[PDB]
């Protein structure tokens, strides 16, 4: 249900383990079917991100969001909305994710009560500002090269993740950008609480198996660090 209190850091870190993000234009298969498969395989959190070319709009976009949210309910996984604060409130989403060029975080926190709030950050200053504004987690990247999102900041590897932890900041962190089954380990080793991805799952020949592999791997990495 809706949160009457801010999510705990311990719980937030658990949800970030395998954070699947997807829109209808990120796969050649049926969108909802791919989300259902990712959830069955083991994704721990899902972000509805519908934007850019050939993306759905109007009520068609709302209906797709409703179907994806229903799939999350069936799987017992939280549903996060990207960018659209109004849609998140209208659908009773579990959270909202925003970036540096979107609505201001302090303004968004005030509009959503105790809903989960994620903020994309690329510098130490941005990470610190996000925490002060009331974010529950920060998405750091691009860790590796990605073409899924064109307008991205420079690739930073795990440098920022390491820098944040070295300064004593314990805010929940999820890495993003070109993450695959074979390169996720360093992200968790650097201090991240999880990995987020689009194409490694959305464009996989077997999305369920990919999600299951991620879930198994991340659990091992987190216990090993
Ligand atoms: C949404 C987003 N934000 C920064 S990189 C990125 C794209 C992630 O896509 P992929 O996992 O396919 O690189
Ligand atoms: C840019 C992003 C960064 N991090 C996350 C978790 N989602 C995003 N859309
Ligand atoms: Mg954004």
Swiss-Prot record:
Query: Is tRNA processing found in the keyword set?
Result: no
Its cofactor is: Mg(2+)
Q: Which residues cross the membrane?
A: none
Q: Which Pfam families match?
A: TMP-TENI
Query: What is stated as this protein's family in its record?
Result: Belongs to the thiamine-phosphate synthase family.
EC assignment: the record states: 2.5.1.3
Output this protein's name.
Thiamine-phosphate synthase
Q: Which residues bind 2-[(2R,5Z)-2-carboxy-4-methylthiazol-5(2H)-ylidene]ethyl phosphate?
A: 146-148, 178, 198-199
The GO cellular component terms are: cytoplasm
Relate the protein's function as given in its record: Condenses 4-methyl-5-(beta-hydroxyethyl)thiazole monophosphate (THZ-P) and 2-methyl-4-amino-5-hydroxymethyl pyrimidine pyrophosphate (HMP-PP) to form thiamine monophosphate (TMP). Is also able to use the 2-methoxy analog MeO-HMP-PP, as substrate in vitro, but not the 2-trifluoromethyl analog CF(3)-HMP-PP.
Q: What induces it?
A: Is weakly repressed by THZ and not at all by thiamine.
Q: Which GO MF term does the entry hold, naming one?
A: thiamine-phosphate diphosphorylase activity
> Which UniProt keywords are given for this protein, alphabetically ordered?
Magnesium, Metal-binding, Thiamine biosynthesis, Transferase
**Miscellaneous information on this protein:** Thiamine phosphate synthase appears to proceed with a dissociative mechanism (SN1 like) in which the pyrimidine pyrophosphate dissociates to give a reactive pyrimidine intermediate which is then trapped by the thiazole moiety.
């Amino acid at each position: 249900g809706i949160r009457m209190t801010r999510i705990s850091r311990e719980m937030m870190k658990e949800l970030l383990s395998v954070y699947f993000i997807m829109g209808s234009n990120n796969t050649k298969a049926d969108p909802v079917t791919v989300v259902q498969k990712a959830l069955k395989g083991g994704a721990t959190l899902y972000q509805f991100r519908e934007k850019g070319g050939d993306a759905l709009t109007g009520e068609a976009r709302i209906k797709f969001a409703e179907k994806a949210q229903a799939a999350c309910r069936e799987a017992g996984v939280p549903f996060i909305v990207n960018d659209d604060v109004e849609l998140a409130l209208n659908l009773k989403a579990d959270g909202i994710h925003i970036g540096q060029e979107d609505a201001n975080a302090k303004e968004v926190r005030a509009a959503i009560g105790d809903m989960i709030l994620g903020v994309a950050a690329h510098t130490m200053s941005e990470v610190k500002q996000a925490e002060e504004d009331g974010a529950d987690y920060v998405g750091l990247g691009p860790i590796y090269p990605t073409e899924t999102k064109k307008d991205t900041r420079a690739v930073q590897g795990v440098s920022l993740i390491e820098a944040v932890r070295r300064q004593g900041i314990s805010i929940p962190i999820v890495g993003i950008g070109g993450i695959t089954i074979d390169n996720a380990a360093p992200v968790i080793q650097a201090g991240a609480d999880g990995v987020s991805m689009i194409s490694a799952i959305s464009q996989a020949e077997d999305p369920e198996s990919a999600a299951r592999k991620f879930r198994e791997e991340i659990q091992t990495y987190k216990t090993g660090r």
